[PDB]
């Protein structure tokens, strides 16, 4: 019993992180088989920060320029791409601690393990969600960037995330590993601003039926609702609104809670439109939205 | 910027978990060197686990009926002792993915790092605190027993836990890794209380900086006050009084603010008797206690 903010270990992904220097700049890269991954602005002075030509920058760089380390020892740096945002360097060794892994574009609501590095060194490991908005709440200093978001099914590592930037509010943005940016960030020193965040109603459900397995059942009410009506009341929230998807995304919970998806929701109604008058709920004075049904399952079974 | 909830990245202790089976029971193991470590209820049937007499169960229990798996090979158990409540199983082959380690008996409101395992294979990563009743608030399922918690110190892990059981409460009760309980606990299925648990005082001062430091300074208030008058308010809300030790293990992050240790000792008062009038910091709607001086100064520095 308990439920946590769990993260995945993180082991198979420490074995995947260097240090990628470009003149004076350092920041993290992913060493899978022979080829480094890393954030494109590495290239960038801080005067190139401001409205950086990257095409016109990267063509001043050769293989050479390039200086991958990997813990002590030196990569030999043999070919070098721009792939929208993310630089790709060819080395001339595969690392020998390549995981079993893929590339993957998560979805808004999805979460995944951040592995928070500086000079290619693991500092430590969160769970984190995509925020609605395709931002994160992350921890991210200098040098953070090229840190990665992951997610791992069984032996597979799915990488989902590269660290870019924090935005003037203090929220995090960056890209998929073939360096799309998630939302409509730009890799450029400018005012972006992210959307309204909504919260992750799917996830906030999920996490009431994780309460009623672990013995926190207190906001259980004799009420329930529809999904219309649940969702003019989202809407007033700032809820995503819930779909049929997402109540079938909940099914394997209602069936071992014995609670239906929408006497849940009305559940959440009430704490909506009530508040939690100075109770918690698994030690937490308000709704959580950074656990998918998926992770409730997994934490709440047993999952290795 | 941002604040999280943040683990020690969980490699190394990856490459320590093991499975150990005795007769039916399986749980989880740590491989350092020639010596695998696990709880010693391992020897326990559950009729055993109401009034279990470890010399006399151990006593019928040969090197071969300790089952040892390190991933999918099987290790040569050439040795056992009980020390406390762990059994020692000498292997006669050194874990190669041993790293430097230490044994540490931490102290109540120090925090850590739990793997949590099954079978002896990691599913997971979160940090916690001792709380001052020496339990912790986890997330353990059967078989996660043997799961262990660490820090790290650049490349020595310092274990400091191994969990050994669940209270009635859903609390978590382990060994330190000479297998002496944190706190009063006896490994027996018996009814056992843990004492009142307080707030870790200078964890929630720490988390109260981390939150200046990172632009969340709307609970800064006008007042100072003293340790006499602090620990009044502190007693009364079952705070753990503060000392000048924990004033002094403050001096970097007060140093780094400009913010004087008793005038935020003033801020957390009005915080206690008022509290936080539906307004969050660091997207908490309570006080975090689970952040030691030291855990803020390594995340808002970038410690690796
Ligand atoms: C310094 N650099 C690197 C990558 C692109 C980017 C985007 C925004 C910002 S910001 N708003 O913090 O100055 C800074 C930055
Ligand atoms: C099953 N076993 C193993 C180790 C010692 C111990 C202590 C308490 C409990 S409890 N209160 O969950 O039944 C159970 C247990």
New binding site residues.
């Given amino acids: 019993s308990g439920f946590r903010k769990m993260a995945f270990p993180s082991g198979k992904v420490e074995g995947c992180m260097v240090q990628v220097t470009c003149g004076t700049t350092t920041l993290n890269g992913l060493w899978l088989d022979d080829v480094v991954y890393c ?1 494109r ?1 590495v290239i ?1 002075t ?1 005067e190139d ?1 401001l409205n950086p030509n990257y095409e016109d920058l990267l063509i001043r760089k050769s293989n050479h320029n390039f200086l991958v380390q990997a813990g002590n020892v030196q990569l030999r740096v043999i070919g070098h791409s721009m792939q929208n945002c993310v630089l790709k360097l060819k080395v001339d060794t595969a690392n020998p601690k390549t995981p079993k892994y893929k590339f993957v574009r998560i979805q808004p609501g999805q979460t995944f393990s951040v592995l928070a590095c500086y000079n290619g060194s693991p500092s430590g490991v969160y769970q984190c969600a995509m925020r609605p908005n395709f931002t994160i709440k992350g921890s991210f200093l200098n040098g953070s ?1 090229g840190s990665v978001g992951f997610n791992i099914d069984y032996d597979c590592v799915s990488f989902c995330y590269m660290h ?5 509010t203090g929220v995090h ?1 960056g890209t998929d590993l073939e360096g799309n940016f998630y939302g409509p ?1 730009v ?6 601003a992210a959307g309204t965040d909504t919260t992750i109603t799917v996830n906030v459900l999920a996490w009431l039926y994780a309460a009623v397995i672990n013995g926190d059942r207190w906001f259980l009410n004799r009420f329930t609702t529809t999904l219309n009506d649940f969702n003019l009341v989202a809407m007033k929230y700032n809820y995503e609104p819930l779909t049929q998807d997402h109540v079938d995304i909940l099914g394997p919970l209602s069936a071992q809670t014995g609670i239906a998806v929408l006497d849940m929701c009305a559940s959440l109604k009430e704490l909506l439109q009530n508040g939690m008058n100075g109770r918690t709920i698994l030690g937490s004075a308000l709704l959580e939205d950074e656990f998918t049904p998926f992770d409730v399952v997994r934490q709440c079974s047993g999952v290795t």
């Fill in positions: 954030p602005h960038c801080s920060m960037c870019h930037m924090e935005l003037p943005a960030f890799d450029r020193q400018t005012a972006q």
